[PDB]
Amino acid sequence: GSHMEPARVRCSHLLVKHSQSRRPSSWRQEKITRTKEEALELINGYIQKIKSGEEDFESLASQFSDDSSAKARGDLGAFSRGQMQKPFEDASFALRTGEMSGPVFTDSGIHIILRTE
Template sequence: MGSKIHCAHILVEKLSVAQDLKARISKGESFANLAKEFSIDVSKKRGGDLGFFSRGAMVSEFEKAAFALQKGQVSDIVKTQFGYHIIKRLD
């Protein structure tokens, strides 16, 4: 596994919203479009794209989930102090 990974995420405040978005992604809706519409993070303008990052750059819960993903895979819902994330590994 490389030292840097490329991910996008959707960040929302409510678990119920995260669950709805996760279901919509599972049915084939565009991760980037949902991020632009629903995410509360500044990365929403880029479809949730966080760029490349290495270990230690993100909070531990987020980092653990992100580094466990394979390219193209979408995480389960991850709770951090910022809210509820859905993470997609881009590269």
């Protein structure tokens, strides 16, 4: 039936990091020269490419995600809200089936969340 707002949700997560972060060193750049504003453009670029049916989320999340989850397709499983960040939570739980939250600002950087489930 129609059961939204659960305990376990599944979504994919892309992450673009910026100079002001827990570490200004990604796997794409040894010294992240891009700030939040700059990273935001990358974010929009990926989002546009994905939703337009040009690129895939898992595709871009594996190459253009500065997170370790990148090599794991960037797709997550069914997790609980207490296992993620509050901004990440609000986004993932507010998304409908096959919906994308867009640029979710966090401490590490900007996350792109797509509702896999």
